[PDB]
Amino acid sequence: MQLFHKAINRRGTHSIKWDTYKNEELIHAWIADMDFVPKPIQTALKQRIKHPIFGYTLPPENIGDIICNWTKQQYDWDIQKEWIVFSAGIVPALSTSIQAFTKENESVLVQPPIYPPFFEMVTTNNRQLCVSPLQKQNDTYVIDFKHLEKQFQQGIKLMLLCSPHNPIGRVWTKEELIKLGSLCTKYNVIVVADEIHSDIIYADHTHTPFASLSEELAERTITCMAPSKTFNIAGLQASIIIIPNEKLRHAFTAIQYRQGFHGLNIFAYTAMQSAYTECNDWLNKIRLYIEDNAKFACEYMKDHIPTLSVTKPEGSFLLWIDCSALNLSQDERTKLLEEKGKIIVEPGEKYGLGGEEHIRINIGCPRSVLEEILNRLRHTFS
Amino acid sequence: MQLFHKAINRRGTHSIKWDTYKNEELIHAWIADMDFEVPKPIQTALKQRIKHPIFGYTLPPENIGDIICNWTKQQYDWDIQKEWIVFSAGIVPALSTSIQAFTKENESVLVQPPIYPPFFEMVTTNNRQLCVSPLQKQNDTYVIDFKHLEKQFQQGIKLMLLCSPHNPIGRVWTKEELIKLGSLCTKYNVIVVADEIHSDIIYADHTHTPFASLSEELAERTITCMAPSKTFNIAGLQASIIIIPNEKLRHAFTAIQYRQGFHGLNIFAYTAMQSAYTECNDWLNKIRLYIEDNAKFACEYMKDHIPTLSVTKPEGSFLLWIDCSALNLSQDERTKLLEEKGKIIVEPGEKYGLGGEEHIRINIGCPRSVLEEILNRLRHTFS
Asked: Contact A57/B238, CB-based, under 8 Å?
């Protein structure tokens, strides 16, 4: 309980959240790393350094079962060791997938509002970017399956599924994924399942890995998972990509190979060793801190900033806030946020359709700091 | 001092060096990382940052840009601008990025064998036309057949991969050799990617010349790749420095990495490389003198003890290029004998292109103890 009350000085660690701006007054609620690493990981790093050579390394011989135990323990999902491919980050895994399974000018589908690199790795690779925006319903979000099918029909070859979905916190139901999977089989669509928030699911929700539902879906899906957001080690660049389809996996690794890829750095393996073995109770406690943090913020906004709409999150530590009642431009919202509130939130307009007049804030903070964020929002717009 | 005589037990450390095969007497002389511990200031730099127990996304160190310009000026008399510096998680991804940025499919990329195999792999796996200009074994070493090299340039070469110092033959190119190379690249508009990852281990009678350093013309048509990985045994930290003076080429390079989702080095590449170019000077000058002494030890040892094998004299790096053709044995009957009779796996020359056949390469970046034993095992194998 007394582990996560920790306000931590992250100024002067060259961290992208706190060291880009140097007005000391600012609070940065926009980037997606936590204000929290479990002790067994930092202990693991000190141990590895005790051997003073840092040359080329293979993945540790025990990493494959560690990973196969991790998926089965956490999602009741059984994987084969030979399905596992390493990636020094998930965004390169998307770009690799775009290159591996689509040709130039072919259609890549995404579901906005969505983490912008979904947009960027498509267009910067000359693939045609297609969208099927999500629909705001029941004060949360749903998939417009009719619109989605219409898009699949125009020749979509590849879809990027974000699950849990950044920035809206949707944790997809088993049934939603089965309706979607049925559409990918119908139109033979390969799915990249960005499931990097796989492990921060709130109490009343269950992460269902898309590939886990059926052998059909498994043979058409590239699953991207990682302890980076989960354990706050994003700067170490450790991701796990799971491709049961051997033929898809080979074409995936051939893209990596021609890009000079030779596996993760030494500390990415070490960290991921400890992350998936020696940190279970830290993760159980960190889930309840954030979920309880979420409920605090939504209660705060009803009592204190009633001008503001909030998507009820179901996983990860991001909070999606609709500001449309303020009837404010992005420019006049952002500038007011920095000048009057002394805070940098995440602007929603860069997330595509349905991001406009929204902001996002990071609730991966000690509660105290969340108090400070909520108070400033309140002061900002009223 | 007693820094480099300490043999290190690195089987059971998941490093590619001693963990491929699991028969313990075996020596695997084929890996090109050294058997020397990282300088203590690097281990201290790593321990220091680990005291801050968060490891999120981090920006490059605000002082890294002047550190690198200080490094290039100090080590090679090369003045560079901070904005030329581009980061890369290793040299091979920088070889590939350069191919994708500056040549289209089927356009011709030339390499000079015998050469490090990734030079070929990134050309062919990238669907570019592979051309060659093999080096010539001349006066006990290797030289460039400039007339052949030119004959290829006339046939439309768009990009050249220069490795300098040359892995595995150890050649540190003279300014005069490189000046002749540059003038040919200007004439036929060849872009040069300069593999200079070995720039910092040069022996006593030789000087490393950055190709881009010679002239402004050559700087604006050259991508120079550098790294502390080989110099200080931190390859697994995946830290490289790419210096692209031409603004238009630099944007085309950065544009390829960006579309491949690249977002810069890991936290410990930044930490480690800072110390490498600041707090490790005296560790390096000892290690260049150590390796040179090992290199001078291997070539007279085999001359006096294993006369069946010719040895190209190295001028830099910690690799040694050994001509075995006098046995006149195939690759398999060489590899087989080396493991059963000598209990040793060396790096096979045949995968190095023309000039690789019946050559082997051993790593001499090891304590003398092991180099004795390797040469000793070489002796028994071939005699």
From this structure: no
